[PDB]
């Protein structure tokens, strides 16, 4: 079991980018919440 | 003026009174008073909270009884130790926190005596562990709103740390009131005597756990674990097929053998090793 | 020079030992 | 004997590099998936 | 002479008023930028944010035209913005004895007597700001007024300016009224006494005074008195390498997160620039283990303070922490880059700080812009191309209405950081010798705490250091040298504002000439002039230029 654990964590690689949400859609969500606060 | 860095110090006991009294008569907006020493212009440290009984049927914050707070006020003067009223509270039950138009009226009746009385909401439903929904507020002058002048003159990056809710933003949290960043005062005198006392066993692990039925349960899991291992002899066989993201959406009607399998491995393991070691200590200890 | 080729290579052993301990602690603290 | 004294240290330390760096680059992706799960 | 020698080389005024000469001769700034930031007129931080920005970008140049254009927008915000307004004037008049009392003759507290005692009470703050590390009549003039004054409203600027002028001097006379400043049993004197009490005992490890401070910071009930002493007991010891570890263990063992945090500042100052294995075990460990956010922020912001000796190594370990779970370690990670690599145009660190402004937390967006400002001062497009990529970005985040005041606060602060002194001053926690520059170390560590006091990060003028060679032949006489360069000439690029309503490498330079420290090696020695330097020209500053 432990060898199936230790011979296993090399294919973790090329995990390039865990983007949170976006930048443009985050600013657009802030603009939509700004419209919800103005309304 | 203020610097919107007001830093309210309360307790470890008053929150307990707030959850108890806000929870006992929870669908009605219950209320009461706050009895603590007012420390200097920035901070306030309210060390005690005493509750006021209600007036009648109906969700309201109706009135105060100065007979009651007069007698109760001098009652602990000649029983315990003297303190001082500073603030007051009510309880938005399953709402969150804001100042309603009724709440701001009795708030306005309480800021007149001392200008730094505290408006306090407790919310005893949406609290789980790290949430409590408190957010003590206080009125701002609507005259300055007519002036178009922005108050409270930030000199410290201490008040703009928690973001206000959109629901209180619907209300007059700012246009009519402001938030205050708080924390809590605890000590080792309180931490140990509640840590060492809440979930404590007595002699329970020094038992055998129904010695005929432990091994009976040890078949009462394994028997259906066979058929679940037959589902593990089923679900692997449709691999190297349609891509496993379809094996993520497609399995939302029927159970998987993989997670359900390793569940009972943990169950059967922890059910056995504990009774195994606890069985063998008593041979040494008892004769 | 060639005398730097082992001292500068054990400096990154001083820097290299700590990392497995650090992610070793983050193994449990992400659970906690 | 500088070839057989000082250059004999070049050949040895690299073997420690060649697997401890593999240990790190395994373990940090192992951290990274869980941290993406956290956020 | 050899008798006047100790006055020439120990008082050292002929670098003070000669750097002041370099600032009064070299001044390349802009009014159009402050007219761009004029459009946000509202009663928020913005007034203090503009009058802190022109003080950040006009350090020691004595230029009162960006403040004297109006009176009403300057005096609009109140009760501490006038404290800040009389605070910001001394950095503008830094390093000059004459124009200290005579321009603030309006701002003496017994001449005008307005309704604001902060406009008149915060003057001695700036009197400490001008004559930091210059002990004269500033000590006893800032002492006799402090024997009899008001409450902790003039005592703030007098106590901080008095300890600042008496910084690291071990004076019993300032320790006298700092004792009775300490034992007031008051909250608002906490910053007043707790910071200067360590300032005057910098690097002294006076263990009876440590016992007074940490012995006093156990029974008091307020937090500013638990905060000024938290930095003071860090600041009493400086660069010890072993002589504080039982104290770091003692403060870290305590249940007080503020005092564990103060142990983190104290282990940060006991290991300045020091690659020591023992401190970074627990230093990094409690950055894991501890649960308060403040001690975690100081814990991850100890890293560049203990490892600014090698700026190549911290982007290998703090990039790993930029994606932490909480915005506190996410915030202190960006500032750990901003304290490690701020002297260099680190393309790697800018590569790390590029997505840091995208996070939905306002203050990590903020400190992304502070560290993004510290990374590229006096750098024009050729050390790294991200300079003008970010010049449009600070305007981009300051000219939006829907942004946070905090999120644009790193931009309006970043303008004064980024255009400092007409690109004549820079940060330097490090000399060419290998010895660190301790008033810039204290200046950046004290500059960290704008959380809990806004002009506590006004203590930054100690970090602004020039990059200018100076030739000299006699005690006073300027020479006439005009040397040149060899390498690519576009490195000598300028700010060059736009003002909307065949390539020379022989850059002839006068005696007060600005130059990049990377451009110290690209120049040509003067070989055809009458003057020839006896010293090999490798460091800037002032040198003898032997007339041959
Ligand atoms: Zn209510």
Curated annotation (Swiss-Prot), chain A:
Component of the 26S proteasome, a multiprotein complex involved in the ATP-dependent degradation of ubiquitinated proteins. This complex plays a key role in the maintenance of protein homeostasis by removing misfolded or damaged proteins, which could impair cellular functions, and by removing proteins whose functions are no longer required. Therefore, the proteasome participates in numerous cellular processes, including cell cycle progression, apoptosis, or DNA damage repair. The gene is PSMD3. It comes from the Eukaryota. Component of the 19S proteasome regulatory particle complex. The 26S proteasome consists of a 20S core particle (CP) and two 19S regulatory subunits (RP). The regulatory particle is made of a lid composed of 9 subunits including PSMD3, a base containing 6 ATPases and few additional components. Interacts with UBQLN1 (via ubiquitin-like domain). Interacts with ERCC6. It comes from Homo sapiens. Residues 15-39 have a biased composition (Basic and acidic residues). Belongs to the proteasome subunit S3 family. Coiled coil: none annotated. This is 26S proteasome non-ATPase regulatory subunit 3. Residues 14-39 are annotated as: Disordered.
Curated annotation (Swiss-Prot), chain B:
Belongs to the peptidase M67A family. PSMD14 subfamily. The modification Phosphoserine is found at residues 127, 201. Pfam families: JAB (PF01398), RPN11_C (PF23594). Zn(2+) binds at residues 90, 92, 103. Component of the 26S proteasome, a multiprotein complex involved in the ATP-dependent degradation of ubiquitinated proteins. This complex plays a key role in the maintenance of protein homeostasis by removing misfolded or damaged proteins, which could impair cellular functions, and by removing proteins whose functions are no longer required. Therefore, the proteasome participates in numerous cellular processes, including cell cycle progression, apoptosis, or DNA damage repair. SMART domains: JAB_MPN (SM00232). InterPro entries: JAMM/MPN+_dom (IPR000555), JAMM_MPN+_peptidase_M67A (IPR050242), MPN (IPR037518), RPN11_C (IPR056263). PROSITE patterns: MPN (PS50249). Component of the 19S proteasome regulatory particle complex. The 26S proteasome consists of a 20S core particle (CP) and two 19S regulatory subunits (RP). The regulatory particle is made of a lid composed of 9 subunits including PSMD4, a base containing 6 ATPases and few additional components. Within the complex, PSMD4 interacts with subunit PSMD7 through their respective MPN domain. Interacts with TXNL1. Transmembrane segments: none annotated. The keyword Glycosyltransferase does not apply. A motif (JAMM motif) lies at residues 90-103. Residues 8-143 form the MPN domain. It comes from Homo sapiens. One of its GO terms (cellular component) is proteasome complex. Gene3D superfamilies: Cytidine Deaminase, domain 2 (3.40.140.10). Its EC number is 3.4.19.-.
Curated annotation (Swiss-Prot), chain C:
The gene is PSMC4. The lineage of its organism: Eukaryota, Metazoa, Chordata, Craniata, Vertebrata. Component of the 19S proteasome regulatory particle complex. The 26S proteasome consists of a 20S core particle (CP) and two 19S regulatory subunits (RP). The regulatory particle is made of a lid composed of 9 subunits, a base containing 6 ATPases including PSMC4 and few additional components. Interacts with NR1I3. Interacts with PAAF1. Interacts with TRIM5. Interacts with ZFAND1. The chain holds residues 39 to 70 of 418 of the full protein. Component of the 26S proteasome, a multiprotein complex involved in the ATP-dependent degradation of ubiquitinated proteins. This complex plays a key role in the maintenance of protein homeostasis by removing misfolded or damaged proteins, which could impair cellular functions, and by removing proteins whose functions are no longer required. Therefore, the proteasome participates in numerous cellular processes, including cell cycle progression, apoptosis, or DNA damage repair. This is 26S proteasome regulatory subunit 6B. It is found in: Cytoplasm; Nucleus. Belongs to the AAA ATPase family. It comes from the Eukaryota.
From Swiss-Prot, chain E:
The modification N6-acetyllysine is found at residue 401. GO terms for cellular component: azurophil granule lumen; cytosol; extracellular region; membrane; nucleoplasm; nucleus; proteasome accessory complex; proteasome complex. The keyword Transcription does not apply. GO terms for molecular function: enzyme regulator activity; ubiquitin protein ligase binding. One of its GO terms (biological process) is proteasome-mediated ubiquitin-dependent protein catabolic process. PC repeats lie at residues 84-117, 122-155, 157-191, 192-226, 228-261, 262-297, 298-330, 332-366, 367-407, 410-442. The keyword Acetylation applies. Keywords: Acetylation, Phosphoprotein, Proteasome, Repeat. It comes from the Eukaryota. Belongs to the proteasome subunit S1 family. Component of the 26S proteasome, a multiprotein complex involved in the ATP-dependent degradation of ubiquitinated proteins. This complex plays a key role in the maintenance of protein homeostasis by removing misfolded or damaged proteins, which could impair cellular functions, and by removing proteins whose functions are no longer required. Therefore, the proteasome participates in numerous cellular processes, including cell cycle progression, apoptosis, or DNA damage repair. This is 26S proteasome non-ATPase regulatory subunit 1. It comes from Homo sapiens (Human).
């Amino acid at each position: 079991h432990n060898m199936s654990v230790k011979a296993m964590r090399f294919p973790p690689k090329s995990y390039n980018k865990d983007l949170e949400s976006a930048e443009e859609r985050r600013e657009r969500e802030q603009q939509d919440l700004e419209f919800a606060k103005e309304m | 003026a203020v610097d919107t860095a007001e830093q309210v110090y309360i307790s470890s006991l008053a929150l307990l009174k707030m959850l108890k009294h806000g929870r006992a008569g929870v669908p009605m907006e219950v209320m009461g008073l706050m009895l603590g020493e007012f420390v200097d212009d920035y901070t306030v440290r309210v060390i005690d909270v005493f509750a006021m009984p209600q007036s009648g049927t109906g969700v309201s914050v109706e009135a105060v009884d100065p007979v009651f707070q007069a007698k109760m006020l001098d009652m602990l003067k000649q029983t315990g130790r003297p303190e001082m009223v500073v603030g007051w509270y009510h309880s938005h039950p399953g709402f969150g926190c804001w100042l309603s138009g009724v709440d701001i009226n009795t708030q306005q009746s309480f800021e007149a005596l001392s200008e730094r009385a505290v408006a306090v909401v407790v919310d005893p439903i949406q609290s789980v562990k790290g949430k409590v929904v408190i957010d003590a507020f206080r009125l701002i002058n609507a005259n300055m709103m007519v002036l178009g002048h922005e108050p409270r003159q930030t000199t410290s990056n201490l008040g703009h740390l928690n973001k206000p809710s959109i629901q209180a933003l619907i209300h007059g949290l700012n246009r009519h009131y402001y938030s205050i960043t708080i924390n809590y005062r605890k000590n080792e005198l309180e931490q140990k005597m509640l840590l060492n006392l809440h979930k404590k066993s007595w002699m329970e692990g020094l038992t055998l756990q129904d010695y005929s039925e432990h091994c009976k349960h040890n078949e009462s899991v394994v028997k259906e674990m066979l058929e679940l291992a037959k589902n593990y002899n089923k679900a692997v066989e449709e691999e190297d097929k349609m891509t496993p993201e379809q094996l993520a959406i497609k399995n939302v009607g029927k159970q998987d053998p993989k997670r359900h399998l390793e569940e009972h491995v943990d169950v059967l393991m922890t059910s056995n090793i504990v009774q195994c070691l606890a069985a063998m200590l008593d041979t040494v200890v008892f004769k | 020079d060639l005398y730097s080729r082992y001292k500068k290579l054990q400096q990154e052993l001083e820097f290299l030992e700590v990392q497995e301990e650090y992610i070793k602690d983050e193994q449990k603290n992400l659970k906690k | 004997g500088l070839r057989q004294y000082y250059l004999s240290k070049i050949e040895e330390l690299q073997l420690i590099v060649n697997d401890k760096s593999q240990n790190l680059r395994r373990l940090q992706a192992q951290r990274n998936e869980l941290n993406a799960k956290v956020r | 002479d050899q008798t006047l020698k100790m006055i020439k080389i120990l008082s050292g005024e002929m670098a003070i008023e000669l750097h002041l000469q370099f600032l009064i001769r070299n001044n390349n700034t802009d009014l159009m930028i402050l007219k761009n930031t004029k459009d946000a007129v509202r009663n928020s931080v913005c007034h203090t944010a503009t009058v802190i920005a022109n003080s950040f970008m006009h350090c020691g140049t004595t230029s009162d035209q960006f403040l004297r254009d109006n009176l009403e927008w300057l005096a609009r915000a109140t009760n501490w913005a006038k404290f800040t307004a009389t605070a910001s004037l001394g950095v503008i008049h830094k390093g000059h004895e004459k124009e200290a009392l005579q321009l603030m003759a309006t701002y003496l507290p017994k001449d005008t007597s307005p309704g604001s005692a902060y406009q008149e009470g915060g003057g001695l703050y700036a009197l400490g700001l001008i004559h930091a590390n210059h002990g004269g009549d500033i000590i006893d003039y800032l002492l006799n007024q402090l024997k009899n004054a008001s409450n902790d409203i003039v005592r703030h600027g007098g106590s901080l300016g008095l300890g600042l002028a008496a910084m690291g001097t071990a004076r019993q006379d300032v320790y006298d009224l700092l004792k009775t400043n300490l034992y007031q049993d008051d909250a608002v004197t906490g910053e007043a006494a707790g910071l200067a009490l360590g300032l005057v005992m910098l690097g002294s490890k006076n263990a009876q005074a440590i016992e007074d401070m940490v012995g006093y910071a156990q029974e008091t009930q307020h937090e500013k008195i638990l905060r000024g002493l938290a930095v003071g007991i860090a600041l009493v010891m400086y660069g010890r390498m072993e002589e504080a570890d039982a104290l770091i263990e003692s403060l870290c063992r305590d249940k007080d997160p503020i005092l564990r945090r103060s142990g983190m500042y104290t282990v940060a100052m006991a290991y300045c620039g020091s690659g020591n294995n023992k401190a970074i075990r627990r230093l990094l460990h409690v950055a894991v283990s501890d649960v308060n956010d403040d001690v975690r922020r100081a814990a991850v912001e100890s890293l560049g303070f203990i490892l600014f000796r090698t700026p190549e190594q911290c982007p290998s370990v703090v990039s790993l922490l930029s994606e932490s779970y909480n915005p506190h370690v996410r915030y202190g990670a960006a500032m750990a880059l901003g304290i490690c690599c701020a002297g260099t145009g680190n393309k790697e660190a800018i590569n790390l700080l590029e997505p840091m402004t995208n996070d939905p937390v306002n203050y990590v967006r903020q400190g992304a812009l502070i560290a993004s400002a510290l990374i590229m001062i006096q750098q024009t497009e050729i050390t790294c191309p991200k300079v003008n990529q970010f010049r449009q970005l600070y305007s981009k985040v300051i000219n939006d209405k829907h942004d946070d005041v905090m999120a644009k606060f790193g931009a309006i602060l970043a303008q004064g950081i980024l255009d400092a002194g007409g690109h004549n001053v820079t940060i330097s926690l490090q000399s060419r010798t290998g010895h660190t520059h301790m008033p810039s170390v204290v200046g950046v560590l004290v500059f960290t705490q704008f959380w809990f006091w806004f002009p506590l990060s006004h203590f930054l003028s100690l970090a602004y250091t020039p990059t200018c060679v100076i030739g000299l032949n006699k005690d006073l006489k300027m020479p006439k040298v005009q040397y040149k360069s060899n390498c690519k000439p576009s490195t000598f690029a300028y700010p060059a504002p736009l003002e909307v309503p065949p390539e020379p490498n022989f850059q002839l330079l006068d005696n007060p000439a600005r130059v990049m420290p990377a451009q110290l090696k690209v120049l040509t020695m003067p070989e055809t002039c009458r003057y020839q330097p006896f010293k090999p020209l490798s460091i800037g500053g002032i040198i003898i230029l032997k007339d041959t």
